[model samples]
Target: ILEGRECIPHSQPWQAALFQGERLICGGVLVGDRWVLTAAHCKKQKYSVRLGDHSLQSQPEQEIQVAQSIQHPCYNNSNPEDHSHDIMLIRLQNSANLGDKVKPVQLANLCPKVGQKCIISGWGTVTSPQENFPNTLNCAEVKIYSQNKCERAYPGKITEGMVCAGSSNGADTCQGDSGGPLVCDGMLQGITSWGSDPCGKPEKPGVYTKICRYTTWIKKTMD
Candidate 1:
């Protein structure tokens, strides 16, 4: 897994069709060497996946296949601060050309409860003013904040399937991190969902979907 770069405040680079010009957005973990997820919004455009990559400026060593995309039925991205069922999977047309630089991470069986610590990484920006998008990859340590606290932090945001991450010390998943991974104990526990509209706010933390709750769907859909 890559460390991740900064990204748009609410979106990721959609890795669409390879051999064609497309973008690379956050995707999901299927098994050890595949991604079974994507952002619903990215489906409207073209992009492709780049495997075995650590830097964002260059293409990945192996450009894998993105055969298909399966978006959730209830996905809605109307609010810039919300990721309502905007989840899906991307089946790689080509199997991973495995390497140490790009080994698949494990998916979790459940979400970390409130107050548990979680790790998030993505290709997004560190600063909203300095960059509108995250670079190669970036990482941050975050603790799960309560739903009530989350609502209070962002106000009129926060959804049921969502869990909060980040701390008050000026760290978080910014714009380009959508649909990325939020890991804990080496397992993919969450999907980087959303953050404060003005990302990196002190009290407002980034949010993600708990992986454990949706493992069945992932297995069934990808299989």
Candidate 2:
């Protein structure tokens, strides 16, 4: 995240690092023993996931192989400006063995209230002027914004699948934080989706895929 503090080591056990070979591509969330979730846009390449990780240099608990990728049937990749149905699920080659360092996240069935505190974490940029990929997980505390606030922030772009959150002090998710989890009230309420090219700007909130809108799809897809 841009302008974030480091998370307490291994506190976010469900955090997943999607790597294209040795290069970290995006962030993800472990949602089941054999399932991890991220953004559909990350489908540009099939990425293996590294779970139970903090520092990029640390040997993670597992660098797992992928079995299948299932993006939403209605997801449209025709336009980069569109983030409708931006969610996806990846089946793992093997089930993750749960431990203190490896776990699954609980999905939220209801949307959080505006002004409720939420969290975002990733190995993305920490700089506003230059790109910087931190070695460890970086976290920022933000709050949910009203739909009207978001609609005004991104005129003609906010969709049903989107939610908005950001801090006035400029703490936010930036490049490389895509596909990460946005947790509120101890449940995952959103997935990091698209935002302004330069994040944390005034009146510009970070947009996320509203998880509550696709709970049924997630269950049916998993089933």
Candidate 3:
């Protein structure tokens, strides 16, 4: 696993930097040449996707206009604590050119087991909420937490569609990391949804939209 705060290149080619009016707001995963998977809560009037780039400030990237934003019908943004059905898909006007720095990730058929190791990558804020988010991509290793443990941590808020993962050393995904990918064994397992503020709280692991639970939805929507 890479050290926390270390810069990575092409490590997560499927990763996407979601922008609104030139400001990075959330992260997304490329599941197809023109399809991006992200949190439904990220919906906006206008959005664009930046692929094949490690740094938002650098080149070698492909910026594509979002043709449509499809949010899950069941998604309810009213109760952010539950964050139920918070997944969405962004359809690009044009397909992405296949290359080393741009590729689609395979979605996992099964949810990651408790204790399984995973990686979460994004350009989100680090440590405190007041800190500035990173300009380059950053990744951290985390372990899946059992549903019981997660439920206990959130106390009656954890839902079936969400999975929790965190590190023992307080390393975790934060604010702008929402809608990012939570990968395990090269397969896309989760999409960052929500978590505690001032991230990296040991008891409050990062919560993600479990990909396995939405496979049918993804297929039906993408087809």
Candidate 4:
């Protein structure tokens, strides 16, 4: 099990479940009325995004069809191991009606401070061999790792646009958690990208696409 706990229902309004018909495929962040930001690696043929959902199997407050999917120009999904430019945008067929349990979150412009506590939430069970995906969304607290430390941790693969974060002990984001939001001080700071194979390893923290590098790109695409 992940080193995390269940978040209060509707606590994370921007949290979204990217679904393929009935199964939950990945987690995402609702950043605009009709725009969702996620990992480019989640590119798929069809998807429906549900907002204001805490429990995956429960009825949704708002479910919208995806109108378009745009991955970053630099990202090439041909190689699954590549985590560079691992961000994507999803345009909804219709704008989501904002409510208490559903709304968009603004992306951050300031670089997150090293050692700042950030929050990562998802329904993934990446470390569990039984595939026990949680019904309710769970959140784990992680600290932003310095670029130098991250480089030492990931070696030659660390990119300028990627951020490394997790605990030295065991906290991390795993499979199915990809495309999820990494919030720091209430602002969208990163997009869950990838991590170690067995999930949480002391030296192998989860990697994320830093959002600050893509605000202009995201705004241009949204327009």
Best by lDDT, which number?
A: 2
Clashing pairs in 2: none
Our model 1 lands, by Cα RMSD against the true structure, at: 5.3
lDDT tens per residue, model 4, 24-73: 78899999988998999888998899888887667337889999999999
lDDT of 3 by residue, 13-131 (tens): 89997898779879999999989999999888888899988877773489999999999999876876558899999999999987777899999998789999989998888756676
TM-score of 4: 0.95
Worst 10 residues of 1 by lDDT: 10-19
Enumerate residue pairs that collide in model 3. Answer: none
Model with the higher lDDT, candidate 2 or 3:
2
Can you give the lDDT of residue 82 in candidate 2? 74
Candidate 4 clash pair list = none
**Most accurate candidate by TM-score:** 2
Candidate 3's error at 14, in angstroms? 0.3
Task: Tell me model 2's lDDT, rounded to 2 decimals.
Answer: 0.88
* Model 4: CA > 4 A from native: none
Instruction: Please identify which of the two predictions, 1 or 3, would achieve the higher TM-score against the true structure.
Output: 3
